[PDB]
Structure formats: structure tokens, C-alpha cells
Curated annotation (Swiss-Prot), chain B:
This is Oxaloacetate tautomerase FAHD1, mitochondrial. Mg(2+) binds at residues 60, 62, 91. InterPro entries: Fumarylacetoacetase-like_C, Fumarylacetoacetase_C_sf. The modification N6-acetyllysine is found at residue 102. Gene3D superfamilies: Fumarylacetoacetase-like, C-terminal domain (3.90.850.10). Its cofactor is Mg(2+); Mn(2+). Belongs to the FAH family. Pfam families: FAA_hydrolase (PF01557). GO terms for biological process: oxaloacetate metabolic process; pyruvate metabolic process. Residues 1-22 form a transit peptide.
Amino acid sequence: RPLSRFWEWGKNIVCVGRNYADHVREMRSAVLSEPVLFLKPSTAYAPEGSPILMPAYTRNLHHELELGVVMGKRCRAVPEAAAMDYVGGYALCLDMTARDVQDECKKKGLPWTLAKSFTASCPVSAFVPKEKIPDPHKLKLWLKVNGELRQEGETSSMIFSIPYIISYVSKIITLEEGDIILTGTPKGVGPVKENDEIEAGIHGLVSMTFKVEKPEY
Amino acid sequence: ASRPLSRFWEWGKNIVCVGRNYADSAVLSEPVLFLKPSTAYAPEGSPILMPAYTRNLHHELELGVVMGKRCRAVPEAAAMDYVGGYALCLDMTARDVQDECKKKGLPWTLAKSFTASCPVSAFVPKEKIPDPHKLKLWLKVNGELRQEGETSSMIFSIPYIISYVSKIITLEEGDIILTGTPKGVGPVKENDEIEAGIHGLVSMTFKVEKPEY
Ligand SMILES: [Cl-]
Ligand SMILES: [Mg+2]
Ligand SMILES: [Mg+2]
Ligand SMILES: [Mg+2]
């Protein structure tokens, strides 16, 4: 029920591939191709207080800073123009990525599961109600690793609008209340190692902190 | 309100699927894994929905293992303790799309993970299946037998699959693992009727439809 704890009860996590233009020239072109989609299991969620867990099989774990859009009602094959009506709110997420594994998956034509969909691969902020974000395309996202800025992005740089992404996703996969869509990452993706501290936020709206750990199991 | 295992498709969060797991070499490789969203579930009474972007929708008859306890990095030797029961599933597959995904190194999502891509039987409690490697699975299309398989032919055991999966992805109560398909996969078209079962345990029937929305 309560969206303020959506990661406890939400079933599904859908993530887009590329959705940020580093330069206006990338709008002039990238729009001609649909967004790539992949899934994370509900057990990817790592709410604040829980660690980023480094999978045992990677030597190149990357952060990807992303705005997540939390669905407030069941959303099946909706038009772009109705999509915002299905949104409950937002959360800042990291699409944690085993980049070495991802390269292997791509090369061999394998699913991206071990690269993208492992336990604790979706660190997630507190929920932000949609009332606080009247325009999700006018947000500024930032991420630091051990105090150094690694990603900074404006959601005004998105290739596809959030309503378009919702619509497109909903035509392939029905979204349930409490499902989240991760809407892509600005430039600056890069690695983290054991004991690194990640701090990230949406300016004026939400702050989060995650420590990178190896599992104790 | 209630969340019995008998209705696990209503409340279960996650669906994990293995790639190849039936022996016609393969042992030398770990199992391939991909996900389906909870909205892939199509319980009996709901249609198999043809995605608009495929011209080659395949049935894949599979035994699903429904988890009964939260299962994180469990050893093969304890894996069966985390099972709640079973369900017969179809891993509905846009095979044309899958070929393109493999060639281009894309996720398998549009091929494997679409709305209604997991037709699912009634729940079978674990007590009724003391050995899930001694089952017979069958599938008919318009009354003609198209897949028949023995789960004794599995490459990887169910406990090994549970262990392996649980080391990558924690499984919650009500999550399901689809354990692969025997030979005979093939296409279906609009208005086809699919009947399938686990011999002596469960059967189901589904119509192939285009969405009315
Ligand atoms: Cl995938
Ligand atoms: Mg991403
Ligand atoms: Mg799920
Ligand atoms: Mg399959």
C-alpha cells in the first residue's frame, strides 16, 4: 500500500539503456531508436541503510546514477498522453552494473542478468511524492565517490520524455502499482571498490549514502 | 488480502528462468538465466497474449519451482528445504526477436519478458512431488502432441539450479524458477488452443489471443 516504503512490497524493476544526450547533436539522431529495456528482481533493492554488495564474480562494478519513476496504479499499454496519471512519485536509484560481465553478455548474446540483476543492484533513496516534483525533466542529479564528483546530470537532457518511456514500457510489460522504471544515466559512469562510499542526490529533494561491501555469506 | 501459495501468481514478485536444461558437453557450462516480470503470469482463465511485434511466438513447456522460504546463497545440499511446491509453466518466447537480441547483444526482454509470457497452472504442493526429477510433462496444440519430456532428462538438478540462482539473486517466498524445456518447441498462432500438464498432477488449457486494448 504505502508508496513511502515501495521497495518493501513492489514487485518489479524495469530499466532503460541509453536515455541521456551529452550534447544536442545526440537528440538530432538517438530518438530514431527505441529504448533498450532490462529487468531487475525485487531483491535488487537496497534501501538506504543497506550496503551496495559487490558480486563475487566481477572486478569492474560501476555506478549508474538514475531517476526512478514509481508507479501509483496499474499501467497497461497506456498512451504517452495519459502516462503521468499512473505515476505515484520518484526515487533516486543506482543501476549497479558488473561492466566486465556486461561486456561478455553482449559479446556472447546472453541475457544481461548477471551483469544487471544481482542482489542489491538497485540502491534506492527515500520515496519522493509526485506533488514535490511537478516537472521531472527539470531536476539536477549528482553522485560522489569518496567525496569526488563522478556524475552530474540534468534530466532536461533526457532523450525520451518520462511519459514516453512509461508508455513504451507499459506496451511491452504491464506495470503494477509500486513498480519502478529507471530512466537512464548521464555521463560519468565508472567503477567502485570495496569500502568506497557513494553519496548522491537530487538537488533540493533527496540525499542518499551507500557503502560498497562484500557480502558476509 | 490473503497470500497462500495456492495463489502464488497473484502476489509473487519474481520469475527466474533457465536457458537450456534438457539433454538430447552442456554440463561444462553454468545455466543461463533471464527474468520475467510478475505481469508475465497468465493464470488459467487468462489468454496467452501475442505481442504485436512478433511473427514467431513459441511455446516452451517447463516445470516451475515455487519458492517457500527466503533463499539467499543456499548450498545445493539444503536447497530443497526452500521449495514450497511446483507449477507447470509456458516460457512463451518471441523467437524471431530472441534471434535478433542474441545477434546484437541486447537484453532478452522483448523476446522473453512480455505481458502474459508465463502461462501458469494451479499450484502443486511439494508434498505431492517427492521427486521432481521423476515427472512427465506434455503439451498439445489443437489436440496434437508437440512436446513430451521426462524431468529425469534435466542437465542440472533442481537443487543445483536453486543454489546457483540464489547466489546471484535472493529469492523470496512465492518467487518461481522455470527449469527449462524438453524438445519440441515450436510456434503458435492466433486462436490456437494449448493444453499441457504434469502427468498425474496438474493440467491446464490456454487460448492464444491478440490483445483487445
Ligand atoms: Cl536480459
Ligand atoms: Mg542504467
Ligand atoms: Mg519482479
Ligand atoms: Mg525456457
